[PDB]
Ligand binder design. Sequence first.
Ligand SMILES: [Mg+2]
Ligand SMILES: [Mg+2]
Ligand code: NA
Length: 129
Amino acid sequence: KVFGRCELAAAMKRHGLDNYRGYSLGNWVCAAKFESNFNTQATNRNTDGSTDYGILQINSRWWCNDGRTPGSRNLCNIPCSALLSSDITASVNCAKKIVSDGNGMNAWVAWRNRCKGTDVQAWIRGCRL
RNA sequence: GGGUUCAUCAGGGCUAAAGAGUGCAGAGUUACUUAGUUCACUGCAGACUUGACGAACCC
Ligand SMILES: [Mg+2]
Ligand SMILES: [Mg+2]
Ligand code: NA
């Protein structure tokens, strides 16, 4: 499943991300856009042997277990397979842990490059929330 | 058997213009969509239009 912009905005709102840790809803929508292009099934392999999974491209070294990543830490207590779902629950719950860990949304390289400091509110414009 | 009107039903859109989308009032199953005051779902109304069993009158 690939989410539409406003469709994802409404789900993320339902899941408590609007102003989660001080980040307005548009930040999360923007981050998904540039991490995954809103694609719940995206994956990307890294040279350290880890893989990024799902709509927020959460990484298998620290956060989720894919059983194929050296030095797995399983800090979200989930298999990476839970992050490849049309149901965004697992991605959101894990993202809430990630963003609470010390550098806020700086954890998402695509957010820092493409979203941080911009008019992120444009990402929720026109949306029925 | 056809016209005018009427009655009881069934169905179908349409409801200024503009606009991809808005008849009016609700809703929220993420479906559809460029998200939407315009969109899946639920009421309600008007002018039509089609069909059915008919009635009055006219040809
Ligand atoms: Mg019109
Ligand atoms: Mg409406
Ligand atoms: Na418009």
